[PDB]
Amino acid sequence: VPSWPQILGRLTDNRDLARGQAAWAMDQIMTGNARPAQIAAFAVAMTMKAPTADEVGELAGVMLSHAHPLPADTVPDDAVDVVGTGGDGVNTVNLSTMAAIVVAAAGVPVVKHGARAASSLSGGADTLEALGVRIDLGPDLVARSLAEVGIGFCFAPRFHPSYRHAAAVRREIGVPTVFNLLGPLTNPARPRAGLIGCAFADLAEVMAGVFAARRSSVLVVHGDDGLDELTTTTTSTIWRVAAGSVDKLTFDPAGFGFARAQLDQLAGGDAQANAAAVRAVLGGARGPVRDAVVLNAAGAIVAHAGLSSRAEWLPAWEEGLRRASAAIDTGAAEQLLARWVRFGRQI
């Protein structure tokens, strides 16, 4: 007999939920059956209790059940995502989005989950829109984008319409909660690999556990400067997910010859400014922004490689860095973006 008093009482008593209770709660939320007060109580109570991977996996599972799927047999088994929680409070250029373009241009299929800004000046979806990319495509056309261009963009609101009730509560309360983890865990194309940024150092291991449960090949990353990306200003903590297990690592870009950057060198502006930064990087502009893009693209390619049990960490990184740099240098990334824009205008 599941109910809000039972579930919220258990959480406020600092107890983990019984199997299925988080799922019940999320389903009530997704079906419009939860009062805003109940949604907010649930999100906050779970956050302060400390969510488990089982619980977060249940929430993401329910979201994915209610999402619009892509058509059968349209997502390659090795497709990758590059996406983060956001909420790092830094307002950088759109590193995941730029990395995603480069990854696809290197020949790794990318189905990117994304959304507009929550607290920053310009989100991934905002910047793509400013570049002339269509962010408004449904399942069939995203599938066609992936096949024809090598990248698809799943705009979260378009694929998760039933999340509107939760999204409203999240905006109202402002404080980050367990809900802030869900975007990266609920790509509707269900790619099995990705580079997944987490702004909240204390919740990254839980995100990794969710991916581990799905047997995804993922690097969950938190820059030690607070970025929900692999950073160039310092080390990053990586929760490496492979073969159903999570391994905690610290990553230093200096190990691959990257010079240290300052965080203000990665600072972003409005959608137009960040669109300009994308163009500059894909056009061959050298500097800190390119370095961060290449590093993150490489990370995603490493995750992709980890779909094979044969993959080795250092060779994977060297290969990833080589491929990412080459995809920019040959013009492949610049061309792929142009083709992506042309594709959307030809619909």
Ligand X SMILES: O=P(O)(O)OC[C@H]1O[C@H](OP(=O)(O)OP(=O)(O)O)[C@H](O)[C@@H]1O
Binding site for a second copy (CB under 8 A): 3-5, 8-9, 11-12, 14, 35-41, 43-45, 47-49, 168-169, 172-177
Give me the half-sphere count of Cα atoms (radius 13 Å) on the Cβ side of residue 342: 8
3-state secondary structure of 113: strand
96 sits near ligand X (criterion: CB under 6 A): yes
3-state secondary structure of 232: coil
Stretch in the footprint of ligand X (CB under 6 A) among 59-67, 95-103, 203-211, 328-336: 95-103
Query: How many angstroms separate the CA atoms of 118 and 162, rounded?
Result: 18
Q: Which residue is nearest to ligand X (CB)?
A: 86
* Options 51, 57, 61, 87; binder of ligand X; rule CB under 6 A: 87
Considering the complex, state which of residue 28 and residue 96 has its C-beta at the smaller distance from Mg ion. 96
Please, which of residues 158-217 interact with ligand X by CB under 6 A? Answer: 183, 197
Stretch in the footprint of ligand X (CB under 6 A) among 87-95, 130-138, 211-219, 230-238: 87-95
Contact between 93 and 267 (Cβ < 8 Å): yes
Considering the complex, state which of residue 4 and residue 313 has its C-beta at the smaller distance from a second copy. 4
Please, which of residues 100-129 interact with ligand X by CB under 6 A? Answer: 114-115, 117-120, 123-125
* Options 96, 122, 180, 187; binder of Mg ion; rule CB under 5 A: 96
Considering the complex, state which of residue 112 and residue 240 has its C-beta at the smaller distance from ligand X. 112
Give which of Mg ion, a second copy, ligand X, none residue 36 binds (C-beta under 5 to 8 Å, depending on kind): a second copy
236 sits near ligand X (criterion: CB under 6 A): no
Element containing residue 237 per DSSP (H, E): strand 236-242
Residue 208 in tokens:
């990794």
Give the residue from 65, 46, 338, 7 showing the smallest Cα distance to 190: 65
Query: How many angstroms separate the CA atoms of 112 and 215, rounded?
Result: 19
In our burial notation (b when 16+ CB lie closer than 10 A, e otherwise), range 269-289 reads eebeebbbbbebbbeeeeebb
Stretch in the footprint of Mg ion (CB under 5 A) among 51-59, 95-103, 141-149, 324-332: 95-103
Contact between 307 and 78 (Cβ < 8 Å): yes
Considering the complex, state which of residue 28 and residue 233 has its C-beta at the smaller distance from a second copy. 28
Stretch in the footprint of ligand X (CB under 6 A) among 55-63, 86-94, 248-256, 338-346: 86-94
3-state secondary structure of 86: coil
Query: Side by side, which strands form the sheet with 110-114?
Result: 151-155, 110-114, 80-84, 193-197, 217-223, 236-242, 245-251
Binding site for ligand X (CB under 6 A): 83-84, 86-87, 94-97, 114-115, 117-120, 123-125, 183, 197
Binding site for Mg ion (CB under 5 A): 84, 96, 197, 228-229
